[PDB]
Design a protein around this ligand. Structure first.
Ligand SMILES: [K+]
Ligand SMILES: [Mg+2]
Ligand SMILES: [Mg+2]
Ligand SMILES: [Mg+2]
Ligand SMILES: [Mg+2]
Ligand SMILES: [Mg+2]
Ligand SMILES: [Mg+2]
Ligand SMILES: [Mg+2]
Ligand SMILES: [Mg+2]
Ligand SMILES: [Mg+2]
Ligand SMILES: [Mg+2]
Ligand SMILES: [Mg+2]
Ligand SMILES: [Mg+2]
Ligand SMILES: [Mg+2]
Lengths: 325, 143, 205, 337, 132
RNA sequence: UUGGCGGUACUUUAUAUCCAUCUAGAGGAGCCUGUUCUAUAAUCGAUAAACCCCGCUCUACCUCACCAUCUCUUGCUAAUUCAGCCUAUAUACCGCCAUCUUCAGCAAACCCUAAAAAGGUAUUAAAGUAAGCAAAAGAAUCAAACAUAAAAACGUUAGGUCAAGGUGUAGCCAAUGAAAUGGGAAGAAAUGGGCUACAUUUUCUUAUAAAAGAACAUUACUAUACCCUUUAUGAAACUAAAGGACUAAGGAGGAUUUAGU
């Protein structure tokens, strides 16, 4: 009562033919695009396939691909025994020959260190590989209990005296922690025809966008869209929003700003200018100050934007009245 | 049969529930004023706000006056709950009630709130005054 | 919210960032180093390092705003402060040297001391038990106690005023009359406390 | 309109109404209307070279044509005959043989078990059903779910036989599960001279008592209908058996195989005691027949012969030899088994 | 529950093709469009007429090749040219396909007054994406 | 021996969540609109949650299916003792959906048991294993995140829809079909939703939401009704818009209830 076909297992003979067909494919794709077959590479292949078979499907897994068989197929679906039927690995009948073969090596290392007999922080800012990464190294499915047990054994190895061989071993299972630098990207300092220094930066609040041009030396003259700021912004709260960047760094009356804000309303345009001024003013302040701006909210774009209306309800969140029952 | 026995793996209600609640509170208060239940339970010096028996009679809920310290209350909770099964035994054995429901211990922090209000209230500014099953189709060749 | 939970509220205190490193408590010192590896929310449109920004008054402005009309609500509060300053200047000039000392002409200090005089220590939460309404004495938090003072002021002026009077003229007359502990809002606080006394026995319920 | 016309797959889905509120919680039959249609054949009878007629005939390139009114009527009638003939084929069926009754599954052959993992065919094995229970159980899917428990037996008629229980929601699935499970539990049953058990067998499996007796050739299978079914699978041709107590089919099947697989062959008895096993047939006179000789060393101590044996006798067996009248139901004329 | 263009789950024995497996919300994500014309682009006219021609062209091809279509046809319009790309099972003899192509091309070229070409890719049997 | 069952509590978990807290509403007035009722010669369907500005992103004729009157009888097509039918059954169905629901489950192939009515977990591991569908992931809102959409199986409600279309069974065929003209009315009624107002954080005017000058309780605020003019579409104004006066009620709404993180 089974019609669903067996999950396909790939013989080494099958993958071997898939690699000869791919190798002949590269020579043909190279001949089509007029490139040299010897130097034709995986990057050139992907670019050629995108030109010859343009697909605009959003998901990239569904687009045409001519990749090396090692990539498209799973890495190790090969037979685990020979013609006679004798498995190749002495731990085959465990069902996790690769997980237990690794736990066999690390347990033997631990025993030699304990029998044979400094700071253990040889590597810092590193993490243990996640289960998904481990499963990729072993090429076999692991459970959470199997991963948890593997880490405990690796930790015990670090606790004990470790020669350079052990340190290299544990290194394989340590992945450098991603380094996201939460530090503002300082803008360059250009020079005008007059020779005065000035920096420029963009800012976006709601639908408003601004392009400020702060000058290193000035008397505090801010011009928005070729107008003064008291005229352009008759509301105090809009002017206070322009005061926040300079007042915070005690730099009032020391710079000359030229703004160009298009889009949005009065408050959204002041907010867009505030960010544009804070980002341009970074080039003329110390790095310790740039961090004080970043930590006071002056350098982060505000992500709050109007939410779309939903069909079947009065608003983005407002619902139609629940008729009286 | 000891192992088998002790493994144990497998308007009427309104007036009745105003007597069981009063009596159970009267009885459990006496149980906790002596080391009879345990020495740990005697030293906790626990007080009982009230007892509430469910309408189904599934459980008997005993409200005990919680204290200020969470650690003191967390300890008291564990000790009281562990002995609740034993406390029920003692009430059936002294013949307080023939049938007693599983005892559950609920916290009563209300006594702290009332003390707080009186503190503020004194300090407040009041102001101046068959066909398919059968082989017939199989044996006829239809299938 | 469009801010992931990892984002941190911005700190807009000018003196705090410029303090000497040694003057900062190690707890505060730790947070600064930690925040260097965190995400910071963008500052609100009404959040500035201005020396004239008072959080209490800014909150009072938002509780008067209707339909997102902040310009009008801020204008009414600005007119109120001026109406209170002008009412004390007249009294100060028309008073003897001895009386002049007591008279307070700072509107920001009359506003804060007015609200504080209208804050109720205890509250009343209405409950229904056995088909009747038994409201019982309750204790109020610092947030609930402040909200009630502001709400009671904005509601006395909005409703119990003549038709042709304006909010800057009724609110000014109440901040000053509350500042002396004689206004109707103060009576609202007194009535709350006196009812709680009456319901002392019903606190158990 | 030509644009309101739907395909056959959608038309039959609606008309049959198989998926519906009534169907699931409580007859129309599907037909294929393109079965006999040959591309290029229409009511008008046109002949299209390269589609419904030869493109070239006797070296002549054909042209379009139309059949005469008489010729087309013949073709129309011929197709009507083929449709009626096809319908007659659908009506015609090959009836299978019943078991112990016409409406019961007991005794019904369901074929050999399926091939094994490496093309291990079992065409020499036959499968027989012994009990089929249709029981409704309680599960959240439908409140009360349905289940079919089927006990089967398998055997090659040459000493190898086995039984298994298969359960499923569908009867077909229970048949498959039981049939392939039983091929993994094959007992080998020892038959004396290929037609009977080596000796009398009496046993009680739970509350089911079985009492088998070794019989001469031509005696046939005078046993419970379920024992006849299994004995044919095992290959026993002549035996008597009586079943008493409970008639539970599983206890009778388990108890039968338990006794038949624990029986002592003559060679085993010769090896255990070291003596010759001799057979005396009344149709061969006093002639001693040697049926088993000890494999190792023949003993010289005669087996002790008691004056009066202490055997425990069954009243049912002895009662007959005591001259007591049997029931009217005993030893009736029955068809060859 | 949504019932639109969803080939519902059976018991693992139903062979669905790639096109049938994917529900409507996967259009432009995992599966493309069966017809490609310029009539639904912004500031373009004659969407109604191009769509009506497509409906007919699909019903015509099903009836002209009854039981011989492995998957839905793909219609491609360039200038006034129409191109029909159909996956067809290898059931009919080879010469019969040449007849239906010559017939279906000429008939649809004189009916819509455009050059129409038929492109047939023959498969040994329907291609099964998954068993559902 | 399984399942079911509770009007079962305690403990966690979360919920614009029962209650509590917060904001603007509904419930009162005037209107717009759906429904029920009354009622008409005069449709139909939805009508607890999950109907009630619902099929309609829409009814002056048309639309139209209704009522009255008159008229046609091979009466759209190549052919057909045929065409045609908004005739009955959504309790025969397809199609396309609602509801629990962004709830976490549904289904099949094997293996095991001193027999199985069933069950099958122990991680320092004791019989379970390996594939599906949903969730998850991925993709979309054109950096990034978050959020929002989309997605959401099997079942539950014989839930909705024979009137989108198609269709099983039964029924009409000088009529239950086709076509033309004229009509399809109203309410001292109840009720759902929406709109506007009840004003001073207001009204009018210029600018523009900045500021300024006036108005500010008897019609001051205040009619998207009625009535009267003019313009727009149309063949037809019975429709819509703009003025004009006329102006009544309304003074922030009892229990109760809706939405929002
Ligand atoms: K349906
Ligand atoms: Mg809104
Ligand atoms: Mg019979
Ligand atoms: Mg009409
Ligand atoms: Mg009409
Ligand atoms: Mg009709
Ligand atoms: Mg239904
Ligand atoms: Mg209905
Ligand atoms: Mg994405
Ligand atoms: Mg998902
Ligand atoms: Mg129904
Ligand atoms: Mg008619
Ligand atoms: Mg204004
Ligand atoms: Mg006109």
């Amino acid at each position: 009562n089974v019609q669903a076909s067996r999950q396909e297992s790939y013989t080494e003979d099958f993958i071997k033919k898939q690699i000869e067909e791919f190798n002949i494919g590269k020579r043909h794709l190279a001949n089509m695009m007029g490139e040299d077959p010897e130097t034709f590479a995986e990057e050139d292949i992907d670019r050629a396939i995108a030109y010859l078979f343009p697909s605009g499907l959003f998901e990239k897994r569904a687009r045409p691909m001519m990749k090396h068989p090692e990539h498209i197929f799973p890495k190790q679906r090969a037979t685990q025994w020979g013609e006679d039927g004798r498995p190749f690995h002495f731990l085959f009948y465990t069902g996790k020959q690769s997980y237990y073969s690794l736990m066999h090596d690390v347990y033997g290392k631990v025993m030699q260190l304990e029998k044979h007999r400094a700071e253990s922080r040889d590597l810092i800012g590193s993490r243990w590989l996640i289960k998904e990464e481990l499963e990729e190294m072993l090429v076999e499915k692991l459970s959470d209990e199997d991963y948890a047990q593997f880490i405990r054994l690796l930790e015990k190895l670090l606790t004990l005296p470790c020669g350079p061989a052990e340190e290299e071993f544990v290194q394989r299972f340590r992945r450098s922690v991603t380094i996201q630098s939460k530090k503002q990207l300082i803008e360059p300092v250009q020079y005008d025809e007059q020779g005065m220094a000035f920096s420029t930066s963009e800012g976006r609040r709601k639908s408003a966008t601004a392009q400020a041009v702060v000058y290193e030396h000035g008397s505090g003259k801010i011009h928005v869209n070729g107008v003064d700021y008291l005229i352009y912004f008759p509301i105090t709260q809009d002017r206070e929003q322009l005061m926040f960047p300079f007042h915070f760094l005690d730099r009032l009356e020391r710079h000359d700003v030229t703004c160009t804000v298009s889009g949005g309303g009065r408050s959204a345009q002041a907010g867009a200018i505030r960010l544009a001024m804070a980002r341009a003013l970074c080039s003329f302040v110390t790095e310790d100050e740039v961090e004080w701006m970043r930590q006071a909210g002056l350098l982060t774009p505000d992500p709050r934007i109007r939410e779309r209306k939903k069909p079947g309800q009065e608003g983005a969140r407002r619902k139609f009245t629940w008729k009286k029952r | 049969n000891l192992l088998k026995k002790f493994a144990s793996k497998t308007k009427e209600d309104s007036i009745r529930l105003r007597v069981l609640n009063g009596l159970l509170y009267k009885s459990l208060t006496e149980l906790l004023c002596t080391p009879q239940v345990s020495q740990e339970v005697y030293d906790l010096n626990v007080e009982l706000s009230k007892v509430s028996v469910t309408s189904d009679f599934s459980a008997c809920r005993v409200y005990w006056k919680t204290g200020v310290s969470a650690e003191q209350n967390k300890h008291t909770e564990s000790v009281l709950q562990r002995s609740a099964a034993y406390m029920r035994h003692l009430l059936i054995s002294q013949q307080t009630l023939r049938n007693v429901p599983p005892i559950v211990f609920v916290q009563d922090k209300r006594d702290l709130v009332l003390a707080e209000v009186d503190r503020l209230l004194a300090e407040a500014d009041f102001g101046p005054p068959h066909r398919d099953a059968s082989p017939r189709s199989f044996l006829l060749g239809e299938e | 919210s469009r801010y992931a939970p990892e984002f941190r509220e911005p700190l807009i205190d000018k003196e705090y960032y410029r303090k000497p490193v040694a003057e900062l408590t190690e707890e505060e010192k730790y947070d600064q180093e930690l925040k260097k590896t965190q995400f910071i929310k963008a500052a609100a449109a009404t959040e500035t390092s201005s020396v004239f920004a008072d959080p209490v008054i800014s909150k009072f402005t938002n509780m008067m705003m209707k339909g997102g009309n902040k310009v009008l609500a801020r204008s009414l509060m600005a007119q109120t402060l001026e109406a209170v300053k002008r009412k004390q200047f007249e009294k100060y000039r028309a008073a003897s040297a001895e009386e002049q000392a007591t008279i307070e002409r700072n509107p920001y200090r009359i506003f804060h001391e007015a609200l504080k005089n209208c804050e109720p220590v205890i509250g009343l939460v209405p409950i229904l038990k056995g088909g009747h309404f038994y409201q019982v004495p309750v204790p109020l938090a610092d947030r609930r106690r402040r909200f009630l003072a502001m709400k009671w002021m904005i509601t006395e002026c909005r409703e119990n005023k003549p038709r042709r009077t304006l909010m800057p003229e009724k609110l000014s007359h109440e901040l000053l009359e509350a500042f002396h502990n004689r206004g109707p809002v103060i009576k609202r606080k007194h009535n709350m406390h006196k009812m709680a006394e009456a319901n002392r026995a019903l606190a158990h319920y | 309109s030509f644009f309101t016309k739907l395909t056959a797959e959608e038309l039959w889905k609606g008309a049959l109404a198989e998926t519906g509120a009534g169907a699931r919680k409580g007859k129309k039959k599907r037909k294929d209307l393109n079965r006999g249609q040959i591309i290029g054949e229409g009511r008008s009878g046109f002949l299209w070279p390269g589609l419904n007629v030869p493109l070239i005939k006797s070296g002549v390139v054909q042209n379009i044509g139309q059949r005469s009114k008489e010729e087309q009527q013949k073709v129309e009638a011929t197709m009507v005959e083929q449709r009626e003939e096809w319908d007659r084929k659908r009506k015609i069926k090959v009836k299978r043989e019943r078991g112990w009754s016409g409406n019961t599954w007991g005794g019904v052959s369901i074929g050999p078990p399926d091939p094994g993992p490496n093309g291990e065919t079992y065409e020499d094995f036959d499968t027989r059903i012994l009990e089929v229970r249709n029981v409704f159980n309680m599960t959240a899917k439908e409140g009360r779910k349905k289940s079919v428990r089927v006990l089967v037996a398998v055997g090659n008629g040459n000493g190898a036989a086995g039984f298994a229980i298969g359960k499923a929601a569908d009867r077909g699935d229970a048949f498959r599960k039981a049939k392939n499970r039983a091929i993994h539990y094959l007992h080998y049953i020892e038959r004396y001279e290929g037609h009977t058990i080596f000796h009398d067998i009496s046993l009680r499996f739970k509350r089911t008592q079985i009492r088998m007796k070794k019989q001469p050739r031509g005696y046939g299978l005078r046993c419970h209908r379920a024992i006849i079914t299994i004995c044919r699978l095992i290959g026993i041709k002549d035996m008597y058996a009586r079943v008493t107590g409970s008639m539970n089919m599983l206890n009778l099947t388990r108890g039968l195989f338990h006794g038949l697989a624990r029986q002592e062959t003559h060679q085993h008895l010769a090896d255990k005691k070291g003596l010759h096993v001799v057979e005396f047939r009344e149709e061969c006179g006093p002639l001693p027949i040697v049926v088993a000789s000890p494999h190792g060393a023949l003993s010289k101590e005669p087996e002790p012969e008691p004056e009066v044996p202490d055997t425990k006798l069954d009243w049912q067996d002895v009662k007959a030899m005591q001259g007591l009248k049997r029931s009217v139901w005993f030893n009736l004329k029955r068809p060859a088994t | 529950k949504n019932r639109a263009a969803r080939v519902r789950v059976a018991k693992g024995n139903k062979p669905v093709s790639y096109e049938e497996a994917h529900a409507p919300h996967y259009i432009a994500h995992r599966k493309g469009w069966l017809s490609l014309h310029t009539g639904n682009l912004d500031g373009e006219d004659h969407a109604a007429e191009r769509t009506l021609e497509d409906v007919f062209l699909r019903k015509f091809m099903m009836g002209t090749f009854p039981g011989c279509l492995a998957d839905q046809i793909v219609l491609k319009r360039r200038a006034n040219q129409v191109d029909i790309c159909a996956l067809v099972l290898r059931q009919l003899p080879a010469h019969k396909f040449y007849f239906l192509v010559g017939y279906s091309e000429t008939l649809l070229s004189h009916f819509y007054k455009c050059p129409v070409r038929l492109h047939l890719q023959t498969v040994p049997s329907k291609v099964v994406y998954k068993y559902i």
